[PDB]
Write a protein that binds this ligand. Sequence first.
Ligand SMILES: O=c1nc2n(c3cccc(Cl)c13)-c1cc(C3CCNCC3)ccc1C21CCCCC1
Ligand SMILES: [Zn+2]
Length: 111
Amino acid sequence: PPKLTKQMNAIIDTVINYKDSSGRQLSEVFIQLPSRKELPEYYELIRKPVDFKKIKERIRNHKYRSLGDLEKDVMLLCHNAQTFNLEGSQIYEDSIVLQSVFKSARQKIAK
Ligand SMILES: O=c1nc2n(c3cccc(Cl)c13)-c1cc(C3CCNCC3)ccc1C21CCCCC1
Ligand SMILES: [Zn+2]
C-alpha cells in the first residue's frame, strides 16, 4: 500500500484498538451503523451517517486525499454519535474520548 494509506490505516487502527483503563474498547459500538431498516430514526436525524467500517473502506479505496479529510470523517462520526445519543451517556462520552485519541494517534503516526 502507498505511504499515506499505511499512515491512515495505522491511525484508524490505533483509534479502533484504544481501550480505557478498565480494558474496554471504546470503538466497539461505532464499528457498524444499525441498518436503515432496523433504526430508521437514526437516519431521520443524522444527515451523513458514517461508521469505522466506512472510514476503513474510504482509506482502503484511496478516497481521502489528506489526513485532514480523514479527520473530517472521524469528527463527523463523533458528531453523529453526540447528536443521536443522550448527553452524558457512555456512548456520547466515548465519542468525545475517541476524538482526542484520533488527534493523538494522528500526531504520533504522521509526525
Ligand atoms: O451514533 C451512533 N449510535 C449508535 N451506533 C453507531 C454505530 C456506528 C457509528 C455511530 Cl456514530 C453510531 C449503533 C450501532 C449499533 C450496532 C448495529 C450493528 N449491530 C451491532 C450494534 C447499535 C446501536 C447503535 C447506536 C447507539 C445506541 C442507540 C442506537 C444507535
Ligand atoms: Zn490500492
